Amino acid sequence: ANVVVSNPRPIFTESRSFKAVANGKIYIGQIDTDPVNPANQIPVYIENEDGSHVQITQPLIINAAGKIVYNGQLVKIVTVQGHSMAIYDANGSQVDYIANVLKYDPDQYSIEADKKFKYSVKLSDYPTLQDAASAAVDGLLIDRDYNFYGGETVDFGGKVLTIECKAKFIGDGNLIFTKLGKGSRIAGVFMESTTTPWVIKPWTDDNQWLTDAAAVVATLKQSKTDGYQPTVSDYVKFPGIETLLPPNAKGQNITSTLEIRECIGVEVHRASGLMAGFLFRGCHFCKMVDANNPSGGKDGIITFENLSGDWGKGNYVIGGRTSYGSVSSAQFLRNNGGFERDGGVIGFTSYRAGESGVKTWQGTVGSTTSRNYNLQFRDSVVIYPVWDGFDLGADTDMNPELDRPGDYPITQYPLHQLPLNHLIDNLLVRGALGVGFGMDGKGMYVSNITVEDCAGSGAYLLTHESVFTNIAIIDTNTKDFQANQIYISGACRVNGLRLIGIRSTDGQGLTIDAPNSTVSGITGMVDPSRINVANLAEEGLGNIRANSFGYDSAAIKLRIHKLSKTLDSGALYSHINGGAGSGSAYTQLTAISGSTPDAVSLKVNHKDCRGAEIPFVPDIASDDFIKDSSCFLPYWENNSTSLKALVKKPNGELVRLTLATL
Amino acid sequence: ANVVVSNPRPIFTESRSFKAVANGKIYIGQIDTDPVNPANQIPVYIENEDGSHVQITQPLIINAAGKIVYNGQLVKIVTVQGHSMAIYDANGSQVDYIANVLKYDPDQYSIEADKKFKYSVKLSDYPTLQDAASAAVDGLLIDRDYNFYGGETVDFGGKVLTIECKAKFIGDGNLIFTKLGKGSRIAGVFMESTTTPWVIKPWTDDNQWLTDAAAVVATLKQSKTDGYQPTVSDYVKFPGIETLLPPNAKGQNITSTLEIRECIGVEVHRASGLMAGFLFRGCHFCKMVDANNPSGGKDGIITFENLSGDWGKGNYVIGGRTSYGSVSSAQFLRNNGGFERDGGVIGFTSYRAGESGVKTWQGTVGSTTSRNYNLQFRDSVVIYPVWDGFDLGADTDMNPELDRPGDYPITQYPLHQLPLNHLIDNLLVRGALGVGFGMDGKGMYVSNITVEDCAGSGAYLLTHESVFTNIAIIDTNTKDFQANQIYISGACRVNGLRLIGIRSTDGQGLTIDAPNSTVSGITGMVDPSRINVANLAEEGLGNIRANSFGYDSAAIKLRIHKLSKTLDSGALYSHINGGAGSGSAYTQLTAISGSTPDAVSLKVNHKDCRGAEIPFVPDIASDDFIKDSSCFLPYWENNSTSLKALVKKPNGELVRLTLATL
Amino acid sequence: ANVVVSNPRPIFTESRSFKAVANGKIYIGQIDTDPVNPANQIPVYIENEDGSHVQITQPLIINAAGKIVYNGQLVKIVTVQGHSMAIYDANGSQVDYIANVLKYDPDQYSIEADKKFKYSVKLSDYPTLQDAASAAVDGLLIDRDYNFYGGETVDFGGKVLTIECKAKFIGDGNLIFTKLGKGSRIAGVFMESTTTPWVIKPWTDDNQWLTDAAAVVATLKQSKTDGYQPTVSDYVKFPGIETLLPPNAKGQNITSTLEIRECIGVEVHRASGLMAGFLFRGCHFCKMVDANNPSGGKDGIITFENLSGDWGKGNYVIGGRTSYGSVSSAQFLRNNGGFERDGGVIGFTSYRAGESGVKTWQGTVGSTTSRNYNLQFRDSVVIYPVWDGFDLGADTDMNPELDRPGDYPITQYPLHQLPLNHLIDNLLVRGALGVGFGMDGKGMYVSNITVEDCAGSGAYLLTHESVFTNIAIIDTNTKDFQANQIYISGACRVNGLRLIGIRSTDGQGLTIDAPNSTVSGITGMVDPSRINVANLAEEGLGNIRANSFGYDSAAIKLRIHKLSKTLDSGALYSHINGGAGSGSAYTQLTAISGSTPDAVSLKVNHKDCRGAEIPFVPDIASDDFIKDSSCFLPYWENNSTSLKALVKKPNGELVRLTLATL
């Protein structure tokens, strides 16, 4: 096509007559210079049958047939590209002084065009993608939908390519890119499944989920988007949705993925597709930049697998608008950030998600540890995940089997106590039907978080001696399913926690459940009955000022929480003494009595009385009712009608006196 | 010099004598092998003048002049790749054999340049932008500055072409990229305007706003930037500007718009300019990624108008940095993001927006409605707007009622009670001369807001049954014009709210005026004389410390807002029994009296007395002052000069009983 | 050794025999024509060795040997357009005739290729970067490792290029790009250093920072990553390094920054490079969106040296994940961003900053100011910076000798009083070994910060008259022995502070040390004996339920921080009676005496008696002990073995009355 079969051994003839210069001489030197000078002489190399290139002295001979002959026979001499010439015949005359042989090409426009135009092969001109890849030198360009061959391999000779995609990759397999340089920029990638699979739509037209098998089935239709494939979790939580699905629409693996195994820093930019997916394997410093709504399929839409080989330092998901799918939206296997928290999602957003919107695989795959450490999950978002929320936790394996094959053994770090030490901040969730988080770790910290309306638990934090700051769990668990709104199974210091919102628990389930954790700054109207924290204290409030709006009194009270859940304990209300629309009020220190609240009172300035209302024991009082020296207690006796008042002697003993006499 | 004359038809000769092969044979085959057995053979083609390549019977023939000959006439044979040549003479002896040879044909360079080069068209060599767009295939460049006339429609077609703009589209008219292809990109546009308009600069040279109507007129300067052209709204924000403002500055329309119609998603990266506009008429999935301070003109800087046809979803303003303009920046219009919140303002920074920061339009523009639903307004900023930092309002109108045509019958949803489902987070506002925040809707879950310094009302929320959180309203109404720093008309429920910073003011009206909401957790300082909520009760918190620094006494200070909300109801507050280190401090429980606080009180440990101090009625007590049983009311008898005790017998009848005697 | 030596001069031999075409003739004509016609003959030029193209007559001649000839001398005959050779022998006969020597018309095709391809010049073709820049119109590409000399000043002539870098850009010192056009898009640059310097790393394998000189010196090694070069300031963090540091590593100044001199809007893009750094000098409206872990050298990784000339508006640092360094990672020097807060930092992510993750070079350099106003720091994060975190101070710490040379006179704004109007929201730090969030200024409104674990200080604030919000300094000062967790010297106001996390304030000093601040609702488990603010008035709180979960009582431990800010000043306990669940508890109003908490208690309902146990002075009462105009004080009289009542008449005449005679 582009190679000529021509005279392989060159012919050098005499200029003034039609004869070859026997015992002639050829010198090769620098461009536009005398080549007779030994210094100007440039290397001139043989090419024997073994591919060697051995230098030889410059005065190359020309035999009596026009070819060039070494001390033996013909040889295929070789110089670099820019070789000058100087023919000298035996006698000493000259024949030629070709200055720059490269200027003698039959078409010397290419020598200039090649140097002032950008190189980019377009796939339309080629029959196979691999053939186009084998020709690209600067950047490929796709101008035609490619029907990829169910998992074909495409090795780009380890080049650096600024691939631009302007057409789909129709197919139902896994196009695999390999051996790309440390500059690749595959962008505009679009993968569409060649097969339209059966999908389910557990939600309805009013944002309200469905946890009923019959309704899920009735919402079973055939289309590439607006749904997802049934998966293991779907018949894990939905009650018996094995028995209501035809085999053909059950356990299929329709998907289209762009696997880029074994590459470093290929920088996948804007990506899209229907039933798409992007599975990086054995990558490092390989980030995926904002992707415009890749509707997922049966595989993780963005899976940063790094099982084999070293860990996965440097895998990012910066930006994104991922949607739908039947398995986790953004996954992470192995992928140790190794200090620097180099990796993890940033600015990500995952609608639907048939699993956690940003999940860090737990347990182990094969015999390889699949947890994720020193990562960074910050400034992200997730909305309406079905089976699991922003599941950060690693080693969340409920099933205990044995030591972890590949990382710290449970003898050193017991499960749910690994020092994976993530970095978290500015998160968000909305409408999650599973659990808002799945965190589990030891000695890590989290920052501003908010879990808005949800149909499941708002937090499942199986941590140990961690710190949670400014958490917000507003109006979560509207389905009433569980009773563990925000659950913490380990010592923790939640501060600035937000709980019940516009929706009212109305005695449903329970709110915060951290019997091993201490929480402070719990703000919001939550019925205190349903709180089970080991400790709780607002140690630091200044000189407070309680206010009451719409009420006729200010309810300042204590409500010992171990004595009785619903029942209180002590209070110092300030009810209006006697209406006095703008007159005054009375203050009373009410205390709970026989299974009743606010029985006794120390009313002060009742009904504008300007005097106290001290209580007294209605009957005889024992000797054990005083525990403090120099104290005065009134107890009444009806028979004599006089008010006795037993007084603990400051000396320490006790005497009984008569205070008021009729 | 473009082509150098050179003879085709290479000549083959012998190796030891100059004679030329006669009737010989040339056999081609794979590298470094015997090229005679079809096992090692490589195809060889004929490249006639027409370019029609054709195969040949393998054994090449050479006439008596050492030239490849086919069918008598000389022919140029072209192989497919590298090959080993074995030239045998008519006798059959090997004239010469070679294993490796390569000489790419110099002909057919256009065929090798149509493929390996990046197609585009520089506008410098085309008369009309439409003519340049017609010839473009997969790229384009604006080298020369264009001069589009008003309404110049440009036809690109399905061409998915990257318009990398390196020049500016000067013109006070509108440029339309009609029916441009899907997946395109536009970068670096620096749109401008031929006519410099008369602008105003309502902010003084140092800072802050000139609320005076006669102050702006001085700023009238006729500069292309540093001002927003006069607008209808300017005639109601500044009272009395109708008169002084000259007619030349009235009714200006100087703006330049890159109107786009009928596209299914085109990025507009780095869309710079001044006096610019970027309307997206009837467009879907188009996102104005990034920007560079386009000092917008009179029309909205980024207006995703869609009321022509379908609802429109996927329109983003992801990223960017906008400034100036007369009408709101980044205004949406009839975009229902769907369930997945596909349209939003994720990331933004607007400066001195003429009307509003992100105003989502309200009511109905023309017959078709002009509202929005299911959009995400996530992390962003709005600096020194004029009217609204974020007018995410829907069916507001304020005055107009009737019925919204095209959204929802007023019967199904009354005024301001629209289900919008906007998700909001990480907002910010500063120096908003008007309302710094405001919307309406039945059910919205707001999150972190952190408004700050403002010269106007902090917020004007008009929702109904919605929950807010981490709302930080700091130092608003710096000019005191409005009587409310926040006004939540509906029965909302705030969940943590900051109010004052340093601009504390006793000249402002009620800072918060939500008459039916239910706030919780008002942390910042505030004059409680200002709150007007329906129920201020944050229930749930631990043991309190009630600290007081550098101040004599520390207090709890209960206050009933039914009673002289300016005066406290009086409560428990310990004082000092001497200089520091005394170790004694008397807890002084109080209770308000007629329009005077702490007139009636009960003390304990008065300056180290180690004893209580019980108040008594100075005059005679009455039954009205008592009601609870088993309690006595010490009242003084001035006549007999002794402490009587009005005792309420447990039996239910009070018997006036003497207590003390002299 | 790539090409095969070959005779370039064309030798012509007749077709049907092996003879040269003696004294023949060549006609060069138009494409696809018969050149014998005198009209079908294009101009034909000689090319000399020197390169002096000259025209000659058409009917070319051939000497006796076949080579072309002109005046008894050989020549190379070239044309400006594709031709159609026609060779005729001396006798007269068409020995051969090529319709198309090249099969295209380069002259005509040159126009089409010029106007249908994307211009660019790969550096491989050019020797010097300056030469490539001169011979480029746009889309310049770097494809070979251009090892620039210590210095390289490149003048681009004002062209608006699109420079790109697919290969390393090695060198040393500081290369200089100059005269870039308004809109360049330098992307993918990758710098390095030709010298591997001796580096240190004060962090062990567990990130437990090092401070002893011996350890840090022991870890001194030679490499480009994993460490930083010592700086003069490094002699302060670790005392004694001046003596123990070997001379070789004592002050090595190595870096590979590219100095973009005077330029406008050269948006740099993804950048990397070991020991690389970058900086802009005298440059406006430029940004460095994104980055890929550029390890720094002796100079700030992203500096903005815009000191000479006018202030540097618009110098953003959007995005990026810089790492390491020895003097800074985002330092700015002189940038007044106007009222639009233009030219700040957004979406950054530092690491192991040698001095600060973000800096503003407070003080003065040369005879010029080095402060910077009206910037914009948001959505950033700096992890484990050594000397400081978000160092944002503008005024010098203690340099009153100068008066802000070229800046607001100290008289106009005293030390640490410059109105900077910075915009700081949504930040974070972690692991800082210095100060987390240092600051200086007046009248500024920082908010929403989440400082995290950091051995050192949580924040050193010198603001005066500033408002804060949502600040969260948690578990800071890990290494202990530091002055304060947070220090706010000024009349500031703070809102929403989080303090202590899961670490114990045992060996630390005052956690909050703002002697003249007015902090609001301080939340979290902080020891109220470690706070030293001037107020905590949080007035605005609602009804509250101070419920305790673990302990056996619920307390309102009212405190006075003037008597003693350690023990207490009176409580409102409510302990349970007869164990939990019995529905019995007694309220205990109390006070302090003898420097022992709970010395006196007026407890109600002790042991479920419905009584009113009251304390009294165990001796004669004193008129001073009573101050209320109407109140009786009980006092015991062991001599009378009875209680007496110190009674004060309403007018004020003291009276004595017995209470309980026996």
mmCIF file of N, CA, C and O in Angstrom, chain B residues 199-221 226 228 234 237-246 433 479 481:
data_model
loop_
_atom_site.group_PDB
_atom_site.id
_atom_site.type_symbol
_atom_site.label_atom_id
_atom_site.label_comp_id
_atom_site.label_asym_id
_atom_site.label_seq_id
_atom_site.Cartn_x
_atom_site.Cartn_y
_atom_site.Cartn_z
ATOM 1 N N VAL B 199 -24.767 53.278 32.127
ATOM 2 C CA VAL B 199 -24.944 52.409 33.281
ATOM 3 C C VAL B 199 -24.989 53.257 34.542
ATOM 4 O O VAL B 199 -24.733 54.462 34.524
ATOM 5 N N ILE B 200 -25.325 52.603 35.652
ATOM 6 C CA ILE B 200 -25.305 53.221 36.969
ATOM 7 C C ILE B 200 -24.501 52.328 37.902
ATOM 8 O O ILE B 200 -24.371 51.121 37.692
ATOM 9 N N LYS B 201 -23.950 52.945 38.943
ATOM 10 C CA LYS B 201 -23.077 52.272 39.905
ATOM 11 C C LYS B 201 -23.590 52.604 41.299
ATOM 12 O O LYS B 201 -23.077 53.514 41.963
ATOM 13 N N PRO B 202 -24.607 51.882 41.782
ATOM 14 C CA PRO B 202 -25.260 52.271 43.039
ATOM 15 C C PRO B 202 -24.433 52.022 44.288
ATOM 16 O O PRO B 202 -24.925 52.300 45.387
ATOM 17 N N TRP B 203 -23.211 51.513 44.179
ATOM 18 C CA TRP B 203 -22.366 51.264 45.338
ATOM 19 C C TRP B 203 -21.244 52.291 45.380
ATOM 20 O O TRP B 203 -20.545 52.496 44.384
ATOM 21 N N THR B 204 -21.078 52.929 46.536
ATOM 22 C CA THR B 204 -20.121 54.012 46.673
ATOM 23 C C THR B 204 -18.709 53.512 46.367
ATOM 24 O O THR B 204 -18.436 52.311 46.333
ATOM 25 N N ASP B 205 -17.804 54.465 46.134
ATOM 26 C CA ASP B 205 -16.436 54.119 45.767
ATOM 27 C C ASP B 205 -15.805 53.180 46.786
ATOM 28 O O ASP B 205 -15.069 52.260 46.418
ATOM 29 N N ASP B 206 -16.077 53.396 48.072
ATOM 30 C CA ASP B 206 -15.490 52.532 49.091
ATOM 31 C C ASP B 206 -16.222 51.197 49.158
ATOM 32 O O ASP B 206 -15.637 50.142 48.894
ATOM 33 N N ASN B 207 -17.498 51.219 49.517
ATOM 34 C CA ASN B 207 -18.315 50.011 49.585
ATOM 35 C C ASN B 207 -19.766 50.437 49.784
ATOM 36 O O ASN B 207 -20.119 51.604 49.582
ATOM 37 N N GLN B 208 -20.611 49.468 50.130
ATOM 38 C CA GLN B 208 -22.002 49.691 50.516
ATOM 39 C C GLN B 208 -22.808 50.349 49.405
ATOM 40 O O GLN B 208 -22.251 50.796 48.399
ATOM 41 N N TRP B 209 -24.122 50.417 49.591
ATOM 42 C CA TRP B 209 -25.058 50.776 48.538
ATOM 43 C C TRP B 209 -25.602 52.180 48.751
ATOM 44 O O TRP B 209 -25.737 52.649 49.883
ATOM 45 N N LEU B 210 -25.921 52.844 47.640
ATOM 46 C CA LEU B 210 -26.534 54.169 47.669
ATOM 47 C C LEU B 210 -28.040 54.000 47.515
ATOM 48 O O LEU B 210 -28.600 54.060 46.419
ATOM 49 N N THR B 211 -28.711 53.785 48.647
ATOM 50 C CA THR B 211 -30.156 53.596 48.614
ATOM 51 C C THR B 211 -30.889 54.843 48.143
ATOM 52 O O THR B 211 -32.035 54.741 47.699
ATOM 53 N N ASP B 212 -30.265 56.014 48.237
ATOM 54 C CA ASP B 212 -30.921 57.233 47.791
ATOM 55 C C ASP B 212 -31.196 57.171 46.295
ATOM 56 O O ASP B 212 -30.393 56.647 45.520
ATOM 57 N N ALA B 213 -32.347 57.713 45.888
ATOM 58 C CA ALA B 213 -32.694 57.715 44.471
ATOM 59 C C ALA B 213 -31.857 58.726 43.696
ATOM 60 O O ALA B 213 -31.496 58.483 42.540
ATOM 61 N N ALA B 214 -31.542 59.866 44.313
ATOM 62 C CA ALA B 214 -30.746 60.893 43.657
ATOM 63 C C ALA B 214 -29.253 60.612 43.714
ATOM 64 O O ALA B 214 -28.476 61.370 43.127
ATOM 65 N N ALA B 215 -28.834 59.559 44.412
ATOM 66 C CA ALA B 215 -27.415 59.240 44.486
ATOM 67 C C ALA B 215 -26.941 58.503 43.243
ATOM 68 O O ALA B 215 -25.845 58.772 42.742
ATOM 69 N N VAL B 216 -27.748 57.576 42.730
ATOM 70 C CA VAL B 216 -27.330 56.786 41.574
ATOM 71 C C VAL B 216 -27.090 57.691 40.371
ATOM 72 O O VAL B 216 -26.103 57.535 39.641
ATOM 73 N N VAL B 217 -27.982 58.662 40.154
ATOM 74 C CA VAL B 217 -27.904 59.504 38.963
ATOM 75 C C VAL B 217 -26.509 60.074 38.791
ATOM 76 O O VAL B 217 -26.049 60.281 37.662
ATOM 77 N N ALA B 218 -25.810 60.334 39.895
ATOM 78 C CA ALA B 218 -24.444 60.830 39.791
ATOM 79 C C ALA B 218 -23.535 59.812 39.118
ATOM 80 O O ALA B 218 -22.648 60.188 38.344
ATOM 81 N N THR B 219 -23.740 58.523 39.396
ATOM 82 C CA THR B 219 -22.882 57.487 38.838
ATOM 83 C C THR B 219 -23.061 57.312 37.338
ATOM 84 O O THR B 219 -22.232 56.644 36.711
ATOM 85 N N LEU B 220 -24.107 57.890 36.752
ATOM 86 C CA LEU B 220 -24.374 57.724 35.330
ATOM 87 C C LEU B 220 -23.128 58.096 34.538
ATOM 88 O O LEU B 220 -22.746 59.270 34.496
ATOM 89 N N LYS B 221 -22.480 57.110 33.911
ATOM 90 C CA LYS B 221 -21.147 57.306 33.353
ATOM 91 C C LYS B 221 -20.950 56.783 31.938
ATOM 92 O O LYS B 221 -19.998 57.215 31.278
ATOM 93 N N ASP B 226 -18.749 47.902 35.238
ATOM 94 C CA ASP B 226 -18.853 48.598 36.517
ATOM 95 C C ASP B 226 -20.224 49.236 36.698
ATOM 96 O O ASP B 226 -20.355 50.270 37.354
ATOM 97 N N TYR B 228 -24.818 48.317 35.975
ATOM 98 C CA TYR B 228 -25.910 47.570 35.372
ATOM 99 C C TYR B 228 -26.908 48.563 34.801
ATOM 100 O O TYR B 228 -27.299 49.516 35.482
ATOM 101 N N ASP B 234 -35.447 48.826 38.969
ATOM 102 C CA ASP B 234 -34.753 49.955 39.571
ATOM 103 C C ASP B 234 -35.703 51.091 39.924
ATOM 104 O O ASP B 234 -35.348 51.951 40.736
ATOM 105 N N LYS B 237 -36.952 49.653 43.559
ATOM 106 C CA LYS B 237 -35.935 49.507 44.595
ATOM 107 C C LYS B 237 -35.476 50.868 45.101
ATOM 108 O O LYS B 237 -35.279 51.055 46.306
ATOM 109 N N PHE B 238 -35.301 51.825 44.196
ATOM 110 C CA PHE B 238 -34.930 53.188 44.555
ATOM 111 C C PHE B 238 -36.136 54.087 44.335
ATOM 112 O O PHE B 238 -36.517 54.324 43.177
ATOM 113 N N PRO B 239 -36.773 54.607 45.381
ATOM 114 C CA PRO B 239 -37.995 55.390 45.168
ATOM 115 C C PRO B 239 -37.717 56.752 44.560
ATOM 116 O O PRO B 239 -37.021 57.574 45.162
ATOM 117 N N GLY B 240 -38.259 57.005 43.374
ATOM 118 C CA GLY B 240 -38.123 58.292 42.732
ATOM 119 C C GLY B 240 -37.080 58.376 41.642
ATOM 120 O O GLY B 240 -36.701 59.490 41.265
ATOM 121 N N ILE B 241 -36.591 57.241 41.131
ATOM 122 C CA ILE B 241 -35.639 57.265 40.022
ATOM 123 C C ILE B 241 -36.321 57.403 38.674
ATOM 124 O O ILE B 241 -35.636 57.591 37.662
ATOM 125 N N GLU B 242 -37.652 57.322 38.624
ATOM 126 C CA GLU B 242 -38.346 57.498 37.354
ATOM 127 C C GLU B 242 -38.017 58.846 36.738
ATOM 128 O O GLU B 242 -37.887 58.966 35.515
ATOM 129 N N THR B 243 -37.873 59.875 37.570
ATOM 130 C CA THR B 243 -37.744 61.242 37.086
ATOM 131 C C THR B 243 -36.320 61.585 36.661
ATOM 132 O O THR B 243 -36.075 61.878 35.487
ATOM 133 N N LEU B 244 -35.372 61.544 37.597
ATOM 134 C CA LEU B 244 -34.042 62.072 37.316
ATOM 135 C C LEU B 244 -33.361 61.303 36.193
ATOM 136 O O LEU B 244 -32.560 61.870 35.441
ATOM 137 N N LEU B 245 -33.658 60.024 36.062
ATOM 138 C CA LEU B 245 -32.913 59.195 35.129
ATOM 139 C C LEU B 245 -33.249 59.605 33.698
ATOM 140 O O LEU B 245 -34.417 59.535 33.300
ATOM 141 N N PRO B 246 -32.271 60.030 32.898
ATOM 142 C CA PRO B 246 -32.593 60.565 31.577
ATOM 143 C C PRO B 246 -33.162 59.482 30.674
ATOM 144 O O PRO B 246 -32.855 58.289 30.842
ATOM 145 N N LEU B 433 -28.332 43.746 48.898
ATOM 146 C CA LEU B 433 -29.092 44.950 49.215
ATOM 147 C C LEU B 433 -30.571 44.648 49.390
ATOM 148 O O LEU B 433 -31.277 45.391 50.079
ATOM 149 N N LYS B 479 -28.966 48.200 56.999
ATOM 150 C CA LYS B 479 -29.537 49.521 56.780
ATOM 151 C C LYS B 479 -30.850 49.740 57.516
ATOM 152 O O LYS B 479 -31.354 50.868 57.522
ATOM 153 N N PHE B 481 -33.829 48.971 56.823
ATOM 154 C CA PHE B 481 -35.028 49.227 56.029
ATOM 155 C C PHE B 481 -36.147 48.263 56.399
ATOM 156 O O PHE B 481 -37.268 48.681 56.709
#
